[PDB]
From a paper:
The [name] cytoplasmic tyrosine [name] synthetase (PfTyrRS) is an attractive drug target that is susceptible to reaction-hijacking by AMP-mimicking nucleoside sulfamates. PfTyrRS is a Class I aaRS, characterized by a catalytic domain with a Rossmann fold (residues 18–260) linked to a C-terminal anti-codon binding domain (residues 261–370) involved in recognition of tRNATyr. ML901 binds the [name] cytoplasmic tyrosine [name] synthetase (PfTyrRS), and then reacts with the bound activated amino acid, resulting in the synthesis of an inhibitory sulfamate-amino acid adduct within the active site of the enzyme.
We confirm that [name] is a reaction hijacking inhibitor that is converted into a tight binding Tyr-[name] conjugate by the PfTyrRS enzyme. The complex of PfTyrRS with synthetic Tyr-[name] was crystalised using previously established conditions and the structure refined at 1.8 Å resolution, revealing a homodimer organization with clear density for the Tyr-[name] ligand. Tyr-[name] makes many interactions with active site residues, involving the pyrazolopyrimidine amine, ribose hydroxyls, sulfamate, and tyrosine. The 7-position isopropyl group is oriented away from the binding pocket and is partially solvent exposed, consistent with the docking study. The majority of the KMSKS loop was poorly defined in the electron density in both chains, suggesting flexibility. Thus, for chain B, Tyr-[name] binding appears to be associated with loop destabilisation while Tyr-ML901 binding is associated with loop stabilisation. This may, in turn, enhance the binding or re-binding of the Tyr-[name] product, positioning the Tyr-[name] carbonyl carbon for attack by the sulfamate nitrogen of [name].
Residue numbers in the entry:
A (entry chain B): 17 to 243, 253 to 373
B (entry chain A): 17 to 245, 253 to 372
């Protein structure tokens, strides 16, 4: 027959693709086993509703999510409303956190996630449907690890250790760890800045002799726009994008920590399977890049000047944000929601 | 007009009465104010179902609760089953913890308390009836205090600082603090070893601008039977000979009251149980005598008018009389006898 061989090849391809969009996988052979389970894998990422959405959580997220769901997975977006509250976001105000969460969902559905295999789940709603199960997990995790081990998860709250260490910094990682089991996740697909608590979950499996362990499929962090005006938001207008890109950090010849180059490589190139650099002839002229290898060689050797990369990145970000811009300009309810949340003060 | 004066006098009597069963009150002025509210005050104590019941948690508790419920209070016994589990009691085993909690309730119902204003509430059951309210309190408390402040509450878990500090030692005090608000308590009536988390609740009110603050009415810790404190305390299932053997060997310094745990039993359990202490002695040792005030009893023993061994002999027989109706419940009620049999087989962790 040879169908067996064809299925092995199919699995190898799905595995190479799933691994492609990741900066790290813990562990690849485990991911291969999960796939042979012959079933939809559950992936998830989670989000504090803390203010307008940075393009990392919309444009970049949509690329990874569509890759995974098109390869048979279901993807949960965990709107971590209680976590934002625990982390002092939006003045702790749950009404504001809820409005922001609603705005997140509007963004995601207009930026490539209006689809059957993506679920938008609210942490508070889901915890309160099964609160004995949820909080019993949280308490059992807290019994298994000492305070220092848990303090090492502080990066998941976006915090440095030099500040005051509130007890919330213990509860939050216990709860994020519980989420991984509570949602029956196969793949934790969060930014690499979440790795500590994802590793904690794997350690908890070993402690409890739980053989079903989650695969950590972490994506890379987009560097900050600068080395409000500090990030591109998913709702930004064309002039807002143009202005923020013009002033962004884009060191000549340097890719490390370069946000402009990161947008080209991680958002724009996968979206178009190319990068078209429009330039005057005296600056090298237009050029179409078909590989990231050439783009990197050309930027590192100075063939691409920062101003040219910036102009092209701005044009592409505006093209990619068009359906979001249009949704929030033309849909009256979404326009009114954005107008409300834009007035909120951003806290921590 | 004569009614106004009489209302004041009544409150003063009730205040001094409630305060008598306490070793510390934070604060008496606040308790007076609570007493003027013209509604029942909610009091509570909570208990990890962890093994045998200490005589302090059965006989002494019933003396205190009877005082409070006859003085305008309602009293909650909080069966802290999830806390026992969090604190690694009974192998963490929630089935054993539930069995032991059932046994505690059986004991308390035979301990001589007026039950019309007493409730037995299970932590897990009540929390899961209102889990959004409860866990939102827990998280807000955790946002309000730093880790070091919460580590200083470790005594409430019966643990020493030299050991490994599991994160459960942070969740537990946040949760005990939450209980105080979740149950809408007016008076936290626990042992003085719970003071840190009770102080935490008060501080939390100040932080949140909550003017309704709980009064901490702490009772004293009953000392261990041996000098400087199994054989270190009476438990609620102990037999008459168990009591006799443990009291007989207890520390009872002749002519000295301080740290004499026998005297601690006379003063905190027996005297409030009988509104007196009737000291039986042979005529050659002074003959029987009734002390009607603790000042009187203390005066006679500190000056050597009371033989230590006479205090032991009576403390033991009075403790035996007091445990009799629990013994009877567990001999004659068949389901109770078997519950006690099962829970005595548990390994204490
Ligand atoms: C803009 C910056 C903040 C950023 N975030 N992310 C990624 O977005 C996601 C959200 O982030 S978050 O809202 O801050 N939430 C958190 O941290 C979590 N604890 C919330 C949570 C998660 C799971 C739970 O079970 C419970 C709670 C993460 O996967 C970040 O790793 C990026 N990815 C690439 N480049 C970037 N610059 C960024
Ligand atoms: C056994 C001995 C040490 C002792 N205990 N108690 C007193 O009994 C009670 C139980 O104690 S416990 O079962 O250990 N539970 C705990 O500690 C709590 N954290 C459980 C809890 C409570 C309220 C909550 O909202 C949540 C959880 C306390 O009031 C002790 O203070 C004594 N009173 C006088 N003399 C004594 N020798 C003793
Ligand atoms: Cl449940
Ligand atoms: Cl509720
Ligand atoms: Na969907
Ligand atoms: Na974060
Ligand atoms: Na050109
Ligand atoms: Na204790």
């Amino acid at each position: 027959k040879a169908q067996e061989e064809s299925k092995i090849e199919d699995v190898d391809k799905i595995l190479n693709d799933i691994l492609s969009i990741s900066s790290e996988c813990i562990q690849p052979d485990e991911l291969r086993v999960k796939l042979l389970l012959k079933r939809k894998l559950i992936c998830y990422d989670g989000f504090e509703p803390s203010g307008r959405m940075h393009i990392a959580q919309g444009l970049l997220k949509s690329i990874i999510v569509n890759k995974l769901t098109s390869n048979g997975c279901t993807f949960i977006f965990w709107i971590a409303d209680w976590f934002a509250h625990l982390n002092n976001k939006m003045s702790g105000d749950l009404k504001k956190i809820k409005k922001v969460g609603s705005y997140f969902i509007e963004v995601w559905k207009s930026c490539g996630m209006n689809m059957e295999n993506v679920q938008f789940l609210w942490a508070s709603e889901e915890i309160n449907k099964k609160p004995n199960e949820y909080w019993s997990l949280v308490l059992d995790i807290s019994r298994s690890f000492n305070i220092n081990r848990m303090k090492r998860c502080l990066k998941i709250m976006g915090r440095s250790e030099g500040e005051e260490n509130y007890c919330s910094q213990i509860l939050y990682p216990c709860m994020q760890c519980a989420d991984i089991f509570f949602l029956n996740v196969d793949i934790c697909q969060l930014g690499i800045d979440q790795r500590k608590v994802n590793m904690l979950a794997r350690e908890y499996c070993d402690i409890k002799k739980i053989k079903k362990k989650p695969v950590i499929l972490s994506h890379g962090m987009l560097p900050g726009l600068l080395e409000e005006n500090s990030a591109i938001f998913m709702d930004d207008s064309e002039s807002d994008v143009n202005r923020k890109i013009k002033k962004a950090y884009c060191p000549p010849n340097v890719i490390e920590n370069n946000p402009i180059y990161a947008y080209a490589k991680s958002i724009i190139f996968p979206s178009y399977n190319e990068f078209n650099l429009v330039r005057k002839e005296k600056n090298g002229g237009d050029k179409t890049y078909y590989t990231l290898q050439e783009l990197e060689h050309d930027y590192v050797n100075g063939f691409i000047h920062p101003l040219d990369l910036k102009d092209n990145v701005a044009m592409y970000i505006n093209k990619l944000l068009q359906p979001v811009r249009d949704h929030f300009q033309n849909n009256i309810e979404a326009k009114n929601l954005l107008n409300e949340i834009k007035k909120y003060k951003v806290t921590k």
